[PDB]
Structure 1
Amino acid sequence: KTRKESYAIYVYKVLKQVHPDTGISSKAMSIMNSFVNDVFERIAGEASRLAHYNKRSTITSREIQTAVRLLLPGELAKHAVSEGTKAVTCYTSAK
């Protein structure tokens, strides 16, 4: 009787968007949870070292963007930059 937060239901929603007629077991859900935490900590640490190198005190979307370009390889990086910019535009225009 104590709470432990994870990413299970969100991975389940993304799976029901791409393949509407399949499921996932518990072990593969544990693997996907570990993958999301791994990539989160890697991008966040890179953005923090950028903000420390430039003598500033704020992590912004430009730091997150440059961390994505340094961390991911080419075509994957271009599609990730496109998706993030589209989300930030749709968030500010729907203020």
Structure 2
Amino acid sequence: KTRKESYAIYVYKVLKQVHPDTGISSKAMSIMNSFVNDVFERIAGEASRLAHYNKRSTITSREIQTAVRLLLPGELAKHAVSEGTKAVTCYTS
């Protein structure tokens, strides 16, 4: 019929790690999808502006780090930047 992509299955895979026996309904999955979209758009927009300021064109893993430091609040920023640098380290090898 009509193909529309969403973050439902990944949200489900994460739920099955944080709580191995609970299950999201349909409305709550729609809400989590909208939340992921919103946060993605915030971080991407801030990284774009932050690259435009220093007169560059590559949006590399430094701009995303600085944008996470700007957007996310005090504590979430630390754990988010930690998870990010850990993942890029475990990916570049």
Quick check: TM above 0.5?
yes
Kindly indicate whether residue 57 of structure 2 is the aligned counterpart of residue 73 of structure 1.
no
Point out where structure 2 has 5 or more consecutive residues left out of the alignment: none
- Aligned equivalents of 2:76 and 2:50: distance in 1? 21
> Where has structure 1 moved over 4 Å in runs of 4 or more?
none
For residues 48-95 of structure 1, what are the alpha-carbon distances to aligned partners after superposition, in whole Å with 9 as ceiling and x for unaligned? 0011000001100000000000001111000000000000000011xx
Over the matched positions of the two proteins, sequence identity in percent amounts to 100
The CA deviation at 1:2 is: 1.3
Q: Which residue of 1 aligns with 2:50?
A: 50
3-state SS of the aligned residue for 1:20? coil
TM-score with structure 2 length normalisation? 0.99
- Aligned equivalents of 1:41 and 1:55: distance in 2? 21
For residues 1-59 of structure 1, what are the alpha-carbon distances to aligned partners after superposition, in whole Å with 9 as ceiling and x for unaligned? 01000000000000000100111100000000000000000000000001100000110
- Aligned equivalents of 2:85 and 2:52: distance in 1? 24
Point out where structure 1 has 5 or more consecutive residues left out of the alignment: none
**For residues 1-95 of structure 1, what are the structure 2 equivalents within 5 Å?**
1-93=1-93
